[PDB]
Amino acid sequence: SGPVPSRARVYTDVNTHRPREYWDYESHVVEWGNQDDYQLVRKLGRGKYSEVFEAINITNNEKVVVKILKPVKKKKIKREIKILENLRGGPNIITLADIVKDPVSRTPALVFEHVNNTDFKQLYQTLTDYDIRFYMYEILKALDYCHSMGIMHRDVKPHNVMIDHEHRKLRLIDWGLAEFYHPGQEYNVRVASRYFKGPELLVDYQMYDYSLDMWSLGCMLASMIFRKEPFFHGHDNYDQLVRIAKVLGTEDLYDYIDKYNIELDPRFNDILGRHSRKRWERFVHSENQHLVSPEALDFLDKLLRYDHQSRLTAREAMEHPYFYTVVKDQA
Ligand SMILES: CC(=O)Nc1cc(Nc2cc(NC3CC3)n3ncc(C#N)c3n2)ccc1[C@@H]1C[C@H]1CN
Numbered sequence: 001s002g003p004v005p006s007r008a009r010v011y012t013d014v015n016t017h018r019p020r021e022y023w024d025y026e027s028h029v030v031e032w033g034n035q036d037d038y039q040l041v042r043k044l045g046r047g048k049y050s051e052v053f054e055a056i057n058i059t060n061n062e063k064v065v066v067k068i069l070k071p072v073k074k075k076k077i078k079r080e081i082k083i084l085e086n087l088r089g090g091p092n093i094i095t096l097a098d099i100v101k102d103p104v105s106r107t108p109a110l111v112f113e114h115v116n117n118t119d120f121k122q123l124y125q126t127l128t129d130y131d132i133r134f135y136m137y138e139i140l141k142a143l144d145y146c147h148s149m150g151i152m153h154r155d156v157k158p159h160n161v162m163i164d165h166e167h168r169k170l171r172l173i174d175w176g177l178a179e180f181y182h183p184g185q186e187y188n189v190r191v192a193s194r195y196f197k198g199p200e201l202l203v204d205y206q207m208y209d210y211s212l213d214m215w216s217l218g219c220m221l222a223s224m225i226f227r228k229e230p231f232f233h234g235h236d237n238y239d240q241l242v243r244i245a246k247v248l249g250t251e252d253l254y255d256y257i258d259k260y261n262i263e264l265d266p267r268f269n270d271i272l273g274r275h276s277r278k279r280w281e282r283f284v285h286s287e288n289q290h291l292v293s294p295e296a297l298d299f300l301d302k303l304l305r306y307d308h309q310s311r312l313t314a315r316e317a318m319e320h321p322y323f324y325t326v327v328k329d330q331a
Helices: 074-086 129-148 199-203 211-226 237-248 250-259 266-272 294-301 314-318 321-329
Strands: 038-046 050-057 062-069 096-101 108-113 161-164 169-172
Touching: 038 062, 074 096, 074 108, 129 161, 129 169, 129 211, 129 314, 129 321, 199 211, 199 237, 199 250, 211 294, 211 314, 237 250, 237 266, 294 321
Parallel strands: none
Antiparallel strands: 038 050, 050 062, 062 108, 096 108, 161 169
């Protein structure tokens, strides 16, 4: 027996109803700007797949962000470009301003709208209970949008969320791991940061959907209200599921494995053990209690579920009591 198939509970056939060129990124023809419009100012960071810089558009004197891509598969470049162009104009989704290439090196560079970010390891410790609900609602606007457009981000983590706190401005950035959702498709489970990886990734369930992003958002929320970063702190991908099972318990995990007929890796048998489902109160203390409320805990519970089909959708999450104040203040 193989694993039981799964379909997204919402926006299942959005790409099926779209013309193939919408999602067939392999056949996308890139539109190139002029590299001489941009001059690099200073370096911002590095990664495995790129080096990013702050730049100046010399034609309008506007501040931009340049992501000079390291050598990767051209279809992976087309995927990011295609996804960025499809989500252009969407709420709290970074804007791809231009796509340029060096004429000598032949290296592609992605040009982004600039967000005057306040580093998450300095910002978060200053954030109030209202700040957390406000920004969580802003990421949810961006997730419901990309999900309604047939796209799963697959890398939701604090580093990929740009916040200009002065102007209460939020942008969900780095769409290099994003994919298009197609019913029946089996995806790569070696996506996302260890700490933000959903149970589906860790057990090797390949037929996942947008609900992957909801798990990641749940990990992010728990790190914020509890002031514990990272919240699930595994030493590897195997220990990452053990750290989760020590909070959610192994009963719901084995019931999840059962439901979908998941062949669990034998390495897991001896490390998972037997753990009870813990109450959220054991992460509450004098230094975080001002951020923890019964609403926050209820919302968090409804996101962090093994069974991807039982987690809240981004639209269901926006309707939760935790955001009543934010929703009211938005009128
Ligand atoms: C361009 C990308 O997605 N990556 C990436 C981005 C940044 N930093 C910033 C900073 C800012 N504003 C701060 C105040 C200067 N803004 N504003 C908009 C964007 C975008 N898009 C952006 N990115 C750093 C490092 C990387 C490394 C490649 C990743 C490896 N994890």
